[PDB]
Amino acid sequence: MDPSSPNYDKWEMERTDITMKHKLGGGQYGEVYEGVWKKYSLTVAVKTLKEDTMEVEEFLKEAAVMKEIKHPNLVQLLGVCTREPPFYIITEFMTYGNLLDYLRECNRQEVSAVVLLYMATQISSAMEYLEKKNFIHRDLAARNCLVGENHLVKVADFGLSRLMTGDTYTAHAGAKFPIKWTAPESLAYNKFSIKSDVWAFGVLLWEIATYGMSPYPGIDLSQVYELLEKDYRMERPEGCPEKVYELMRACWQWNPSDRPSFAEIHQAFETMFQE
Numbered sequence: 251m252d253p254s255s256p257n258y259d260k261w262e263m264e265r266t267d268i269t270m271k272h273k274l275g276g277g278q279y280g281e282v283y284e285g286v287w288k289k290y291s292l293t294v295a296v297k298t299l300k301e302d303t304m305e306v307e308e309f310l311k312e313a314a315v316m317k318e319i320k321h322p323n324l325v326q327l328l329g330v331c332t333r334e335p336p337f338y339i340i341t342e343f344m345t346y347g348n349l350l351d352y353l354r355e356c357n358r359q360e361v362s363a364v365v366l367l368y369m370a371t372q373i374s375s376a377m378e379y380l381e382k383k384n385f386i387h388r389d390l391a392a393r394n395c396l397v398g399e400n401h402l403v404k405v406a407d408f409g410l411s412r413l414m415t416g417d418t419y420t421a422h423a424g425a426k427f428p429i430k431w432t433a434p435e436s437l438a439y440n441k442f443s444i445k446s447d448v449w450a451f452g453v454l455l456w457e458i459a460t461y462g463m464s465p466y467p468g469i470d471l472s473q474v475y476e477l478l479e480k481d482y483r484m485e486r487p488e489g490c491p492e493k494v495y496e497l498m499r500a501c502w503q504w505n506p507s508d509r510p511s512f513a514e515i516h517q518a519f520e521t522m523f524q525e
């Protein structure tokens with residue numbers, strides 16, 4: 251649109267500028283398609299919404315949030331289409347898909363110990379940025395991260411609580427929650443803070459260290475809280491360095507105030523990234 255007009259929005263773009271293909275099949279994100287931005291011949295990801303009227307308000311609050319955040323490890327917003335009907339939200343396309351499947355299907359000789367540490371450092375960087383910005387993620391997990399060329403990893407948020415066709419998001423009052431990634435206080439008092447993101451990050455670390463295994467393997471959801479209260483915690487994965495595991499442990503402190511901040515977690519990783 252024209253800079254001469256009330257509410258000019260630099261993010262608004264013209265639909266005709268993008269060629270729509272078919273949905274993105276990875277774990278499949280619902281109404282998100284692969285598209286091309288003719289101008290730059292770029293493949294992009296386009297989340298749509300046209301008949302799901304219930305979202306509009308929420309689909310729009312999402313767009314607004316993404317305009318407020320910028321970081322090399324956060325999926326980069328390219329443009330929106332929040333004017334005419336078929337609403338869009340264009341993002342960059344990450345060549346290798348979500349991090350969970352990536353870890354499960356990768357060549358482990360290539361994605362070695364040093365690459366896993368690199369991936370965790372990138373994520374903690376994005377989270378340190380969000381911590382500084384006073385933004386809360388609420389659904390940090392490998393399924394929500396994306397992988398690019400050269401093991402570039404970016405944090406995103408696919409609003410998957412709706413997709414869950416399995417055991418990942420157990421229902422809780424019209425609101426689905428990924429119980430095994432949720433901190434104690436978030437399960438008990440429904441209190442979400444940046445410290446509960448730190449708890450989720452600890453679980454994300456476990457996912458990476460195991461190349462994508464499911465948290466608390468074998469244990470049923472209904473006993474996860476009780477177990478945690480009795481001080482039960484996942485054990486150091488096979489081949490997981492002691493320093494990394496000790497960090498996992500700090501992220502799982504029962505009292506959120508005892509959990510490290512993402513700033514110190516990021517510093518710990520950079521340092522550790524030595525050698």
Ligand SMILES: Cc1ccc(NC(=O)c2cccnc2)cc1Nc1nccc(-c2cccnc2)n1
Pocket residue numbers: 274276279282295296297312315316325339340341342343344345346347348396406407408
């Ligand atoms: C198209 C799109 C629309 C909105 C958001 N939003 C967010 O990621 C987000 C971040 C922070 C807060 N709220 C929302 C992200 C995207 N990107 C997006 N969505 C699903 C799959 C993929 C995808 C899959 C495979 C390869 N590359 C990208 N990308």
